[PDB]
Structure formats: structure tokens, C-alpha cells
Subunit: 152 residues, 6 copies
């Protein structure tokens, strides 16, 4: 049977780091479900995310009204969560989340990949602040998300 | 003379991990004062914690108006602060605090215990995320505190 | 495609922590190969591990002349390497090895699992040091590897 | 490159640990510009900092309205950013900012000085919490900043 | 439990950091045993540490052939292991040990103290390197260990 | 103080990480000394490194017999030591080294630069093992050093 993974996240905004991880998990799982956990509408956001990922046949996007990620995985038939780790802070944060999740849904595995070195310093919080100051972060964004962004 | 330790905290809520550290430090010190720094009434928390720590004869609960923890310890004749460490982010946060405490009250020693591995991942803000979303976190709460909790 | 994973190690000795990781990874992958990179003769090492891992159909064991882990993975048709992370130290060490592996073989992906918490303090140098002083670590080794080690 | 450094920060308030980093980095660069990004009016903040740094003739203060730090460094002609690291959390944090700044302005180098161990536990939020409760942290502040502190 | 604490170590040499830890835990325990696990002879070693520790009435020195710490605890009748933590590397190291000891002897508690800031950088191995090149590390050693040391 | 830095190391072999640091520090100091502490004759190693660095007019190579890094600096008139940081581990190790050197020679300032992200996973123990086993690590070596490694 299939191995399906939920990639949860808020994707505000989606990054090349995000896509990179999406790309690589697409190679490892039969399928990958990107759960966007809800300025930019939930008709909008899914759009851009679907556009950015169209190249991979076994990926799809989903607006999850906010709720236990393991609930939402259980519903879609996901036995795997997939997450990236970029630095120690990130490791300890995800490790906590993964331990809670194993408590709530022990039959779900969290699986990790390391961020690719070009994207390891990138976090939405740092990104937004730079956007807000109008630095050029175009190299870190899927271009559709980029084109989309500059009506701000 | 008695060696008295103050265990500061807001116990919002108190976890089995807290209890474990209290149980462990009641073996270490002559007595342990649970300083609840201020959901429910200042009366009610006291009650609950007292209930949960009832089995430990040398442990008592004192609601504290917000002040310097070291001033609060000075007041009670506690020459020791007892803290847990659960992970590296925890270590660095507590270490800062102890050093500033050592600067403020050089006579008071902060002592540390490490979290028991079943609880190392449990923080109060994560516990609260799970509760918000309806997750079963009962194995992490003192039975009285869980019962007293369903009621809101 | 098809998803084949190399789990490299020295397994000196093989713990329940190793096993946990094998079992978890036996559910992610079409198949998982255990690379014993070379006390006891390789026959026994191979035998013990096979014996201890005899419940999982899609797991096999392979002795490896030590050599680059990425080459030995090419030979097996493994596109994946599977690793545990048990703490920060483990994290920084596997990260380095994973990037180098990626530079040596950008088509093998390294995949991570966090250690399950009864085993996250276990490492074979700690084990071996405890074993050398007569300490009881029977709970930490698979029964057969244990039974076998008492015989030597 | 000409040796011109921007030392950015909020200095709310300026500590001795700040003053220490300025003194050392004024031995390294031709000129050091203290970048104060906006309690007390920026007007008072300026006076106060130039009061504390008065003995170092190659140091000077500027009030910057928040804008990208690199952009402030360009308008000033500085090719060096100077930062302090006090612990691991701070390392990973400054590292992200430096990688991002290298992106926005790769001609600008970020340079690091390790916190002098008497001020390593000292951060702003901490100091202020202590001040909020009347703790004596006078040792951590340059006398001129203490004297100006008392009025509320 | 009786407030009897084992402070195990190789003490070669014993530094002012060790002594600082001993002094601080002599404020806490009724008995602090320095379990000295065996350059100079046992005798000389015993004599020097006894001499360094002479001002604390509840401290005694005991030589011990290398063995599991928790067996040496059992035999001496200590209920506590005391250890210091100087940085993150020390934190993860001590943590694994403490976890394994709890498994060996769950009735023995490990208690932790943070290193005092001025000795946080001193490890016995960095210190041997520096002595081995003739640097002046006399401030880091108890006056008497230092004399005894020139001589030999 | 005069902008004379020492860059101490064993350079076995020398990497592009090394070269990057040198290039960057060459922009910041008036003179950078490569301090080579002693497969190759020192004389060979000297010409190799000189050849790698030939393009920076303020850089120079000096062989030193093993000794306290700060004595070597003082001998050569360097007021600054320049080091790199690649990860948390390196950060904690450098930091102990810097504090000790500061105790030993408080007039000498240690200055840090963060490793560039292509080279941040590269350590000399890691390359050696890879060279041992025959892997193409040529994008991590300056060519002249690499060509020379075809020896035996
Ligand atoms: C958005 C995400 C994935 C980032 O860490 C995480 O915050 C998440 O799961 N949000 C939805 C709520 C949930 O399930 N919490 C359970 C915590 S054990
Ligand atoms: C911050 C907290 C909740 C847990 O670490 C606890 O330390 C706390 O609020 N204490 C009361 C305020 C105080 O004494 N702050 C100065 C500490 S140096
Ligand atoms: C699996 C490992 C790395 C221990 O973590 C170790 O078992 C290993 O690889 N041995 C073969 C040598 C190798 O391939 N080195 C290059 C790694 S970049
Ligand atoms: C004040 C300071 C230095 C503390 O970290 C930092 O917050 C800072 O840079 N503020 C200016 C805004 C900026 O340039 N942000 C993007 C950095 S990638
Ligand atoms: C070597 C020493 C004294 C610190 O310099 C201490 O760390 C130590 O534990 N020594 C060996 C005894 C032992 O029981 N090891 C297994 C621990 S689970
Ligand atoms: C080459 C180098 C710098 C890499 O860490 C390291 O090997 C080094 O320090 N060598 C010289 C010996 C020294 O000075 N030791 C004590 C410093 S407190």
C-alpha cells in the first residue's frame, strides 16, 4: 500500500526551502500532501502553492482549517509526517512537536530531512522582516509567489 | 539546620513533570516550598497543587505576589532554588537566570535536576496547544488537575 | 520509483535503539539493508543481527568492507541512507556526514529519524564502558545479542 | 577594505557588556559607528551613548530610523558590521542574520566578538525584568546610564 | 534520603572549579565525599585534595579503584551524585551518564550545579595542554596543588 | 592597535574554507600571518600554502614549532588572532580557547568569522577519511594543494 505523508505548515510565504523539501519528499513518498494550516485568501494561497508544485505529479495541496495535525493526517490516510530541520533551535523545537505527536497518534511516524545549505538560514519570520524593509529576497521565493507578492 | 528550597513556577498548569521534580527534590531538601507566582482562583490553584502534592509531608504551597524570586526566597528562609532542565534551550534560559540570581542574592544557590525522559518534551505552551485543539494529554497531568480541568 | 535504504553502522554491539530504528524504517521503505561495516567473527555479527531482525520481511543484512558509504550504497541499489539523531551532538555530526555524502553522491538522499526516548542516552561507547565494569544493560540489547555476549 | 564598522543595536538600555564590545572593536577598526535604531527620546539616548563612549575618539553615534542594517551601513560607508555572541542561542540567531546580510550586501563583512564572561548572561529582556522589580543591576550599567535611569 | 553525596572525578589536576563546586555543595549535603578514582601517587593525591579541602568540616576524601560510580556510591552509602555542568557539551554528556546511572541505580539521584562563570572555560584537558607549554594557570589551581606541581 | 593578526592552524591539508577566511580577514587586517604549526616537509607545506595565498599581498606564511598560540603571536607582533566558527561545537571549543588565551595574554584580542556555507561541513578529520577512501573532494581543496596530494 501507499506511503503518504502530510507536510504541515503555514507557508506564509512559501519558500524555495519549502519547495526543496517538497521536491525531495516527493521522491521518498508515494504521495505528499501539503497541508496549509489557515491578507491572502484560502482560495489564493492554495492557488500559488498548487502552481509552485505542478511539476510533481504525486503532490497535492489542502486547506486544513486549523486542528491537530495528527487528526488531519489520520483522515487523509497519512502514516507519515515530514519535516525539515535547519539548525539546533529548529531540531529541538521539532523534536518536542514530534514527541507530542507520537503520544497522540503513535502509529504516525515523523520523518526528517535536513535543509539544503542555501536555505538553512531562511525562516518566514526573517524573510517577512526583510520583505517589510524591501530587501530583495527573490532568490528565495518560487517566482510565482514572488510575482504574486509584489502587489503589497 | 533545615535546608529549604523554593521551587518557583506558574504551574499553568502543573504537570506530572513538575510532580516528578517535586517528588525528587523532597528527598533532597528538608523541605520544599512550591512558589506559585501570580484561568482559576489564586485560591483554587493553591488548592489543586496542595491536593496533588498531598502525599509529601515536607512540601508546602505558598502563593506569591509577583516579586523577585530571590526576595521571595530570602523571606522564607529558602537558601536554595530548585529548577529542572529538560533540553538545551532550557539549560541556556535557566543558566542565565541563575547567574542573574547569583548576582542578586549571592547567598542563594540554584540547584538543577534533569527532566525525567517521559516529560522532557512537555512545556506548558505546547500542552496548551494540545488542550486548545482537544487532544488527550491526560497522562501528563496529575489526576486531580485533569478532572479539575475538563470543567471549562 | 522503488525505495531502498542502507542503514550503515558498526553495531558494536547492536542495541534495542538500533532495532527500533530498523523497525520504524522497515515501514517507510520497500526495503532496508543493514550495512555492518567491519570480540566476535563477522559470521556471528551477521548471524546475530539477522537473528535479532528475523521478524521484518523487507530487512536484510550485509557485511561491508569498509569503504565510502555512498559507494557501498550504489552497489546495493540503495537510493536512501537512513540515520537516527539522539541529541544535539548527534545532529551536528550526522549533518556533516550527510552533506559530504551529498557532495559525493547528490542522488542518494539521507533520511532521519529521532531516537525513541528510552534509548536516546544509549551510544555504544557508553554501553561498552558500562559492560566492561559489570553493569546490567540487558534491557538495552536484543536478547540473543545479550545471550550471546554472556557466552563470550 | 577601509576599516569602518557599524555596530547596530537598540541599547535599551546600553550595558557594560555593550560598552566592552565597543572598546574592543575600537582597537580593531579605524572608526566605529554606533547605530542606534528607534522610554527616552532618541534624543536622550544619543547624548547618553556618546557620554559613555566619550573616551574613544574613533567612536561615534548615529540615530537610525529602522531600515535594513546593510542599507544603513552603505549610507555610512561602513564595510563592517560588528556583532557580539554570548551563548549558543545568540550564535544561531546572529548567524541567520549574517547569512541574510551577506545575501543583501555580500561586500559587507560581519565580524564577531565573544561576550566578556561577566556580561554573558546579560540580555535586555532580562535586565528589564529585573529593573521592573527594583533589583540592583547597577554593576551592569555604565554609571551615567544608571543616574539617568532612576526617574520614571 | 540521607544527605550523603558522592563527587566523583579524576582530579588531575583539581582546579579551583572543582573546589568551588565542593564548597557549594558542602552548603547542601551533610556529607560530601570526594571519590577520587585512580603522575603523583594515590597518597600524594589524597594528601593534596585533603589539604585543598581542609576548611570544610563535612567534606572528606576517599580514593577508589575505577569502577561504576553508582557501585562506589552504594558502598560509601551516598544517595546523591553531584556533578557540574560548564557548557552545552558538558550538559549533553552529563545527561547521558545521569540517565544510564538512573537505570543502574534508580535510587541514586544525580544533582547538578552550574560552573561558576570564571571557571566555565577550564577543562582538565585544556588545562593540561596549557601546563604542558608552560603557561601561567596558577589562578585556576589551589595554591597548594600549584606548588606541589612546580616541584614535580 | 596595529592590525596584525595571526591565523593559527595545522593546515593538514589546507582547504578552500581556510582560504576563504584568509581572504576575508585579508580585507580587515593590515597583515595576516598564517601560522603553520608542525607527509610533507614544513618547507613543502610552506610553499604549498604560499602558492595558495600568492594573490593577497598582506598575507604571509610562517612555520612555527608547536607552542602556545599566544606566545607565537607575541613573537611576531600580532595583536589579533583570527578564528572561524562552523557550528555549535566549534563555537564552544573556540570559546574556551579564546577565554583561556585571554587569561594568558589579555592584550591579544581573538576575532571571529563564520564559515562560508559551502565549507561549513568541512573539517579536516572529515576530509582525511574521505581522501583515505578515494572520494573526489577536489572542489574543497585549492588546486595546487590537490595536485600535490597525488603522492601516495
Ligand atoms: C504548523 C505546525 C506543523 C508547525 O510546527 C504546528 O504548529 C502544528 O501542528 N499546528 C497545528 C496544531 C497541532 O497539531 N499542534 C500539535 C502539537 S504536538
Ligand atoms: C521567569 C520565571 C517565570 C521562570 O524562570 C521566574 O523566574 C519568574 O518570573 N520569577 C519572578 C520574577 C523574577 O524573579 N525575575 C528575575 C529572574 S533573574
Ligand atoms: C556511517 C558512518 C559515517 C558513521 O556515521 C561510518 O560508519 C561510515 O560512513 N563509515 C564508512 C566511511 C565513510 O563513508 N566516510 C565518509 C562519510 S562522509
Ligand atoms: C538591532 C538588530 C541588529 C538586533 O539583531 C537587528 O534586529 C536589526 O538588524 N535590525 C534592523 C533591521 C534589519 O536589517 N533586519 C534584517 C536583518 S537580515
Ligand atoms: C571518569 C569520571 C570520574 C570523570 O573524570 C566519571 O565521568 C566516570 O563516570 N568515570 C567512570 C565510572 C562509570 O561509572 N562510568 C560509567 C557511567 S554510566
Ligand atoms: C591550531 C589550534 C589553534 C586549533 O585549535 C590549536 O591546535 C592550538 O591552540 N594550538 C596551539 C596550542 C595552544 O595554544 N593551546 C592552548 C590554547 S588555550
Amino acid at each position: 500500500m501507499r506511503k503518504i505523508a502530510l507536510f504541515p505548515g503555514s507557508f506564509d510565504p512559501m519558500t524555495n526551502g519549502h519547495l526543496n523539501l517538497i521536491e525531495r519528499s516527493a521522491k521518498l513518498f508515494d504521495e505528499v500532501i501539503i497541508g496549509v494550516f489557515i491578507l491572502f485568501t484560502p482560495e489564493e494561497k492554495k492557488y500559488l502553492i498548487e502552481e509552485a508544485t505542478k511539476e510533481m505529479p504525486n503532490v497535492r495541496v489542502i486547506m486544513q482549517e486549523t486542528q491537530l495535525t495528527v487528526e488531519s493526517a489520520k483522515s487523509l490516510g497519512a502514516n507519515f509526517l515530514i519535516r525539515g530541520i535547519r539548525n539546533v533551535k529548529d531540531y529541538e523545537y521539532e523534536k518536542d512537536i514530534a514527541k507530542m505527536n507520537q503520544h497522540l497518534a503513535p502509529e504516525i511516524e515523523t520523518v526528517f530531512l535536513l535543509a539544503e545549505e542555501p536555505y538553512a538560514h531562511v525562516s518566514s519570520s526573517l524573510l517577512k522582516e526583510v520583505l517589510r524593509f524591501g530587501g530583495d529576497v527573490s532568490d528565495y521565493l518560487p517566482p510565482n509567489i514572488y510575482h504574486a507578492l509584489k502587489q503589497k
